[PDB]
Amino acid sequence: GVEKVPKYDIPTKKVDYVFIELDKMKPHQQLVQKELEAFIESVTGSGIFWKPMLLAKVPGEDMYLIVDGHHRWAGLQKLGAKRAPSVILDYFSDDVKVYTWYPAFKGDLNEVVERLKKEGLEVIEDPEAEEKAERGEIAFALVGEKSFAIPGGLEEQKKVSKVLDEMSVEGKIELIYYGLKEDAREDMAKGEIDYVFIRKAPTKEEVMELVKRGEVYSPKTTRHVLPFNPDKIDVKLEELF
Ligand SMILES: Nc1ncnc2c1ncn2[C@@H]1O[C@H](COP(=O)(O)O)[C@@H](O)[C@H]1O
Ligand SMILES: [Mg+2]
């Protein structure tokens, strides 16, 4: 998929799954086309669904927040499936932490900047962009050899993400999402990427607040962390109808 594999593999736990209906699941963020496509081709080609979704009960509603699994959920719905193997978490437990994913690309800076500006964004050379972004003062810092601030907030984060999605689909860039900006910097030094987009992470209270208002974030805004990753499961795609 589109995400960089973590450098350190956290413990696994055989937590087992429960089937939950896809129509009881509530997204909190947008999709990346290449992530959706890769999931659909993997599950249909292999015939096996091997990673359970992460869910949490929405306060006041007979619905589950999609904690992790937007592309699995959208892809399964598109395929015509009914349900997905899921793990129901306690969202406000201290054993659910949240960080973010940083969009990054291998490709031409000037082409990306041109496309961002055509979308109506400002891209301002600014040596303090990274720390402004970490403080949540701008939508993203675009950082590599050079440093740019992209002013704004949620709407601007969506416009940035849309441009990257389109350029990825067009083949103009390789789009990769990093859990840790230091990993992006390390890969930048190896020539594996050119630029990373830095943003402040959301809080769990902000995520549920946004979900309750019926809004969504730009893709990969939340990176939820548990004390483990669930072990692989072995569920036939046909069992999901
Ligand atoms: N055959 C498969 N069964 C279940 N999950 C998969 C499969 N192939 C890829 N994935 C995962 O699907 C996820 C796509 O993003 P998301 O569903 O939004 O978390 C990634 O975590 C992939 O590791
Ligand atoms: Mg995911």
From Swiss-Prot:
Active site: residue positions: 29
Catalyzed chemical reaction(s): L-serine + ADP = O-phospho-L-serine + AMP + H(+)
Alphabetical GO biological process terms: cysteine biosynthetic process
Effects seen without this gene: Disruption of gene does not lead to complete Cys auxotrophy, but mutant displays a growth defect in an amino acid medium depleted of Cys.
Binding site for ADP: 42, 48, 50-51, 68-72
Class of the enzyme per the UniProt entry, highest EC level: transferase
Family membership: Belongs to the SerK family.
Name recorded for this polypeptide: ADP-dependent L-serine kinase SerK
Organism: Thermococcus kodakarensis (strain ATCC BAA-918 / JCM 12380 / KOD1)
Lineage: Archaea, Methanobacteriati, Methanobacteriota, Thermococci, Thermococcales
Name of the gene: serK
